[PDB]
Amino acid sequence: MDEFEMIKRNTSEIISEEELREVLKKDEKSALIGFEPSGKIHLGHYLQIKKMIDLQNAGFDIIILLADLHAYLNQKGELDEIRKIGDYNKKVFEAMGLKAKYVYGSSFQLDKDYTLNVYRLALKTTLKRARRSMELIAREDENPKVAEVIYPIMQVNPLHYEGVDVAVGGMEQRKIHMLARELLPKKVVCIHNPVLTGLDGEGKMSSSKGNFIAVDDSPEEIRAKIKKAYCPAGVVEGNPIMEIAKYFLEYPLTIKRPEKFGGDLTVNSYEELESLFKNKELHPMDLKNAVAEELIKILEPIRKRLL
Ligand SMILES: N[C@@H](Cc1ccc(Br)cc1)C(=O)O
């Protein structure tokens, strides 16, 4: 894989790929991701951080926006407590091996120019579109607040992207990013990462849903979570165990089993794994055993540093 293919690997879309190729030619390029700070950092976060690390390996300067004001607007609590969750997230991201600059949103998002741009964009953005943009992001609320529609307009504020060539986020961000594509004065390449399925297979992985493996989970804990996880024989779609295998594991993968079940299996790619599992040659228990043990090893250094 050249740089472009490394970056493209395991993303859901790049907007646009011709734009990304132009960016890669530059000496200096920057990529941004924002996160509302989360009390637990989970594999969904890790997947994206891994992508920022790809970008870093591709010579991008990395910026992590600790989106405290956004989290505030999205009902995650008071700013001071959010910022301390932010500082913890920074430690986790550093433990994952990311080399980045960290910025707290509230550092600049209360500046007069930033605020003026919020209001200018507020004039340009329909309520309907703002609300549509937040469907996968907004905290559940029986009586949606004005804060909900301020959030996306802040996210499209041009002062977040000045000197940034690439923005990365989950596919949940795509409607907001489409807003930005249309409104931003200077185009920024969007790279969208896939959204992991929840361990119970019931919806998307999320902090509020308690359906994820946190990167600092004890090995006992990871094993129990994976043991209970949705993982029907033969089915790859919406199978979180297969997702973990696709997104986190290295190949060739050596799947240890009893000789009773075929004995050790060596698989040279995720697509190879996909065919075996789909053909019912690899049973969920062994796939889970392998995924849990490889995942524990993957996360070990991170859990260890957070010690
Ligand atoms: N919308 C992202 C947070 C975010 C992302 C990007 C900016 Br700019 C501001 C905030 C959230 O879902 O984590």
PDB file of N, CA and C in Angstrom, residues 196-206 209-213 225-226 228-232 238-241 243 288:
ATOM      1  N   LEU A 196     -18.520   1.097  14.646  1.00  0.00           N
ATOM      2  CA  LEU A 196     -18.543  -0.259  15.107  1.00  0.00           C
ATOM      3  C   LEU A 196     -19.879  -0.610  15.667  1.00  0.00           C
ATOM      4  N   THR A 197     -20.187  -1.882  15.565  1.00  0.00           N
ATOM      5  CA  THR A 197     -21.407  -2.398  16.089  1.00  0.00           C
ATOM      6  C   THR A 197     -21.213  -2.669  17.568  1.00  0.00           C
ATOM      7  N   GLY A 198     -22.296  -2.538  18.316  1.00  0.00           N
ATOM      8  CA  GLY A 198     -22.261  -2.809  19.747  1.00  0.00           C
ATOM      9  C   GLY A 198     -22.039  -4.274  19.982  1.00  0.00           C
ATOM     10  N   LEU A 199     -21.430  -4.595  21.120  1.00  0.00           N
ATOM     11  CA  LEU A 199     -21.126  -5.979  21.471  1.00  0.00           C
ATOM     12  C   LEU A 199     -22.338  -6.895  21.409  1.00  0.00           C
ATOM     13  N   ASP A 200     -23.517  -6.379  21.732  1.00  0.00           N
ATOM     14  CA  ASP A 200     -24.727  -7.189  21.658  1.00  0.00           C
ATOM     15  C   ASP A 200     -25.355  -7.220  20.266  1.00  0.00           C
ATOM     16  N   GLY A 201     -24.682  -6.621  19.289  1.00  0.00           N
ATOM     17  CA  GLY A 201     -25.162  -6.566  17.923  1.00  0.00           C
ATOM     18  C   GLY A 201     -26.413  -5.730  17.662  1.00  0.00           C
ATOM     19  N   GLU A 202     -26.840  -4.904  18.616  1.00  0.00           N
ATOM     20  CA  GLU A 202     -28.194  -4.320  18.587  1.00  0.00           C
ATOM     21  C   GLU A 202     -28.251  -2.923  17.971  1.00  0.00           C
ATOM     22  N   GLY A 203     -27.124  -2.234  18.007  1.00  0.00           N
ATOM     23  CA  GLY A 203     -27.005  -0.938  17.376  1.00  0.00           C
ATOM     24  C   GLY A 203     -25.544  -0.630  17.345  1.00  0.00           C
ATOM     25  N   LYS A 204     -25.210   0.641  17.247  1.00  0.00           N
ATOM     26  CA  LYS A 204     -23.827   1.064  17.185  1.00  0.00           C
ATOM     27  C   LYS A 204     -23.207   1.135  18.552  1.00  0.00           C
ATOM     28  N   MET A 205     -21.916   0.856  18.599  1.00  0.00           N
ATOM     29  CA  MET A 205     -21.138   0.992  19.804  1.00  0.00           C
ATOM     30  C   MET A 205     -21.234   2.437  20.275  1.00  0.00           C
ATOM     31  N   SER A 206     -21.352   2.655  21.577  1.00  0.00           N
ATOM     32  CA  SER A 206     -21.400   4.024  22.084  1.00  0.00           C
ATOM     33  C   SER A 206     -21.125   4.059  23.565  1.00  0.00           C
ATOM     34  N   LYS A 209     -24.260   3.726  25.756  1.00  0.00           N
ATOM     35  CA  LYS A 209     -24.988   2.470  25.615  1.00  0.00           C
ATOM     36  C   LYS A 209     -24.343   1.315  26.374  1.00  0.00           C
ATOM     37  N   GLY A 210     -23.143   1.540  26.887  1.00  0.00           N
ATOM     38  CA  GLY A 210     -22.423   0.519  27.623  1.00  0.00           C
ATOM     39  C   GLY A 210     -22.355  -0.786  26.872  1.00  0.00           C
ATOM     40  N   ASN A 211     -21.974  -0.725  25.595  1.00  0.00           N
ATOM     41  CA  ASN A 211     -21.932  -1.908  24.708  1.00  0.00           C
ATOM     42  C   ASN A 211     -20.596  -2.044  23.987  1.00  0.00           C
ATOM     43  N   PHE A 212     -19.530  -1.731  24.700  1.00  0.00           N
ATOM     44  CA  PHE A 212     -18.227  -1.630  24.055  1.00  0.00           C
ATOM     45  C   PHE A 212     -17.149  -2.221  24.922  1.00  0.00           C
ATOM     46  N   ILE A 213     -15.997  -2.432  24.318  1.00  0.00           N
ATOM     47  CA  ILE A 213     -14.806  -2.776  25.036  1.00  0.00           C
ATOM     48  C   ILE A 213     -13.988  -1.514  25.128  1.00  0.00           C
ATOM     49  N   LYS A 225     -16.763  -9.970  27.960  1.00  0.00           N
ATOM     50  CA  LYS A 225     -17.515  -9.139  27.013  1.00  0.00           C
ATOM     51  C   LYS A 225     -17.615  -9.809  25.656  1.00  0.00           C
ATOM     52  N   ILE A 226     -16.494 -10.365  25.220  1.00  0.00           N
ATOM     53  CA  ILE A 226     -16.436 -11.070  23.946  1.00  0.00           C
ATOM     54  C   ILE A 226     -17.178 -12.388  24.028  1.00  0.00           C
ATOM     55  N   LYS A 228     -19.913 -13.007  25.711  1.00  0.00           N
ATOM     56  CA  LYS A 228     -21.346 -12.699  25.643  1.00  0.00           C
ATOM     57  C   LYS A 228     -21.751 -12.078  24.306  1.00  0.00           C
ATOM     58  N   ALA A 229     -20.761 -11.661  23.523  1.00  0.00           N
ATOM     59  CA  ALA A 229     -21.005 -10.852  22.340  1.00  0.00           C
ATOM     60  C   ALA A 229     -21.813 -11.570  21.274  1.00  0.00           C
ATOM     61  N   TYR A 230     -22.684 -10.828  20.600  1.00  0.00           N
ATOM     62  CA  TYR A 230     -23.388 -11.317  19.416  1.00  0.00           C
ATOM     63  C   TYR A 230     -22.386 -11.757  18.346  1.00  0.00           C
ATOM     64  N   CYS A 231     -22.550 -12.957  17.787  1.00  0.00           N
ATOM     65  CA  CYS A 231     -21.572 -13.510  16.842  1.00  0.00           C
ATOM     66  C   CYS A 231     -22.126 -14.783  16.232  1.00  0.00           C
ATOM     67  N   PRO A 232     -23.226 -14.664  15.473  1.00  0.00           N
ATOM     68  CA  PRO A 232     -23.896 -15.840  14.943  1.00  0.00           C
ATOM     69  C   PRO A 232     -23.023 -16.516  13.918  1.00  0.00           C
ATOM     70  N   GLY A 238     -22.759  -6.947  10.846  1.00  0.00           N
ATOM     71  CA  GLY A 238     -23.212  -6.549  12.163  1.00  0.00           C
ATOM     72  C   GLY A 238     -22.741  -7.458  13.278  1.00  0.00           C
ATOM     73  N   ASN A 239     -21.715  -8.258  12.989  1.00  0.00           N
ATOM     74  CA  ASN A 239     -21.049  -9.121  13.947  1.00  0.00           C
ATOM     75  C   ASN A 239     -19.854  -8.309  14.494  1.00  0.00           C
ATOM     76  N   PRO A 240     -19.915  -7.859  15.758  1.00  0.00           N
ATOM     77  CA  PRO A 240     -18.828  -7.020  16.274  1.00  0.00           C
ATOM     78  C   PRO A 240     -17.508  -7.735  16.443  1.00  0.00           C
ATOM     79  N   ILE A 241     -17.548  -9.051  16.618  1.00  0.00           N
ATOM     80  CA  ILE A 241     -16.329  -9.845  16.795  1.00  0.00           C
ATOM     81  C   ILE A 241     -15.573  -9.874  15.470  1.00  0.00           C
ATOM     82  N   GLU A 243     -15.877  -7.555  13.185  1.00  0.00           N
ATOM     83  CA  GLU A 243     -15.406  -6.174  13.058  1.00  0.00           C
ATOM     84  C   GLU A 243     -14.074  -5.993  13.762  1.00  0.00           C
ATOM     85  N   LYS A 288     -13.908 -15.977  18.681  1.00  0.00           N
ATOM     86  CA  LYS A 288     -13.910 -15.221  19.934  1.00  0.00           C
ATOM     87  C   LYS A 288     -12.650 -15.461  20.767  1.00  0.00           C
TER      88      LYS A 288
END
